């Protein structure tokens, strides 16, 4: 996350870290939507050009974490994955349309002050909050900057990072890139000279873009960190998987496969 700040304790209790088992490695962000289901980006699991291609036996997740580099005894939980599911129409060989995947935990994780599910949007929430200018929140342990110098690397924070960003008008998103944009994605970020900056970055893929409903006070996961061209460049924006638009598939998986 570029230009973000440290998360407060328990600020994003649905935050999940996706790791490759061996060699052990932090791969992507993800989110908890129930005691047995985790949401992430399809490209985190299946995407050859980025050394991504894994089944449930290649991965594990850590839930309830705040600091990347410290073992948080009696707070963090670890879990194997029973199975992974990728949207059947997920398109990697072009623009990553329907960049979404679900992962079922081998056992239910216990909720606590630090582990708690985020809500998925219904039509009314989507219709009322997905408006240009309305802000959402993106979180992750991804890189702090797109570039590196001889003395300063891209940077990997130890503490979870968070940034608030405004949803952008679709025509602006479209004109900012040559990559085709579908109705299964939306973009967010500040325009040049709105002053503020901020963006998700390498390593934040799969993490959530959440909005706090002023109607019932609950946090809803409106998007998934999907793609971008570099990080926090002027005139560029982050793209996110449109969760509500893929709700039918999400429901099918949970209903058809459990928990």
């Amino acid at each position: 996350i570029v230009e973000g700040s440290d998360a407060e304790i328990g600020m994003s209790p649905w935050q999940v870290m996706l790791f490759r088992k061996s060699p052990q490695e932090l791969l992507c962000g993800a989110s908890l939507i129930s005691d047995r289901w985790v949401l992430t980006a399809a490209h985190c699991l299946l995407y050859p050009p980025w050394d991504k291609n894994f089944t449930e036996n290649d991965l594990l997740v850590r839930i309830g974490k705040h600091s990347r580099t410290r073992y948080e005894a009696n707070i963090e939980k670890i879990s194997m994955l029973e199975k992974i599911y990728i949207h059947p129409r997920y398109n990697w060989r072009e623009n990553l349309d329907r960049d979404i995947a679900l992962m079922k935990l081998k056992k239910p994780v216990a909720f606590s002050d630090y582990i708690h599910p985020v809500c998925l949007p219904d039509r009314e929430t989507a219709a009322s909050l997905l408006q240009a200018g309305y802000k959402g929140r993106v979180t992750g342990w991804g890189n702090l900057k797109e570039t590196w110098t001889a003395n300063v690397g891209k940077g990997q924070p130890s503490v979870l990072q968070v940034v608030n960003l405004p949803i952008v008008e679709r025509p602006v998103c479209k004109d900012s890139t040559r990559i085709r944009i579908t109705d299964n994605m939306f973009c967010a970020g500040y325009k040049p000279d709105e002053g503020k900056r901020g963006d998700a970055c390498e390593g934040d893929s799969g993490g959530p873009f959440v909005m706090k409903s002023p109607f019932n006070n609950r946090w809803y996961q409106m998007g998934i960190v999907s793609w971008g061209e570099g990080c926090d460049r002027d005139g560029k924006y982050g793209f996110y998987t449109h969760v509500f638009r893929l709700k039918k598939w999400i429901q099918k998986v949970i209903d058809q496969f459990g928990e």
Partner: peptide
């Protein structure tokens, strides 16, 4: 929807995090 989206250390305790107000204010601007 169960108890989704209500954080134990914030909403459940009537405490607001440091930046959620910026989110709320954006539904006006």
């Amino acid at each position: 929807e169960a108890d989704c989206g209500l954080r134990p250390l914030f909403e459940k305790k009537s405490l607001e995090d440091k930046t959620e107000r910026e989110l709320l204010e954006s539904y006006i601007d």
